[PDB]
Write a protein that binds this ligand. Structure first.
Ligand SMILES: Clc1ccccc1Cl
Length: 162
């Protein structure tokens, strides 16, 4: 297991434009296209991302190419964020993947509400952190995924993903 395999389980793989859990147009492995309700706007973002006229459909290779870029940018964003970097750097590699997972799903702005959880994580108060993490819109709206990510933070193992 690693961050790619982890997100591939949590995000799935779909080669046609679909709506994510929040109703936003998305493709591939959780590649958010736009928060606009316009499918035409989404199709434009897709074409822009792939570099060709896709007509709303992409290949597995293209999906994986976007996925690699998205993971890379998520991690790099963490390192560039003064509130996230110290916590991330304090973590072991397994819990780091859990951190990347969260940012991938909710973005840095979504993670901004988690200040108290991040402090507990930096403190390595794992059980307390896990309890705090579940007190969130995130957990309530995607409990099965949140439980997997939280278990990963709690234990520093890949138990929740087999
Ligand atoms: Cl970047 C991030 C997201 C969620 C928990 C910890 C960290 Cl460092």
């Amino acid at each position: 297991m690693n961050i790619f395999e982890m997100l591939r389980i949590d995000e799935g793989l779909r080669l046609k434009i679909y709506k994510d859990t929040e109703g936003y147009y998305t493709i591939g492995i959780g590649h958010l296209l736009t928060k606009s309700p316009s499918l035409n706007a989404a199709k434009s973002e897709l074409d822009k991302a792939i570099g060709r006229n896709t007509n709303g459909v992409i290949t597995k290779d293209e999906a994986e190419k976007l996925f690699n870029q998205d993971v890379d940018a998520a991690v790099r964003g963490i390192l560039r964020n003064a509130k996230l970097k110290p916590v991330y750097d304090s973590l072991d590699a397994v819990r780091r993947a859990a951190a990347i997972n969260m940012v991938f799903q909710m973005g840095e702005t979504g993670v901004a509400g988690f200040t108290n959880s991040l402090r507990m994580l930096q403190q390595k108060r794992w059980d307390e952190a896990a309890v705090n993490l579940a007190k969130s819109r995130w957990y309530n709206q995607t409990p099965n995924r949140a439980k997997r990510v939280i278990t990963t933070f709690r234990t520093g193992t890949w138990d929740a993903y087999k």
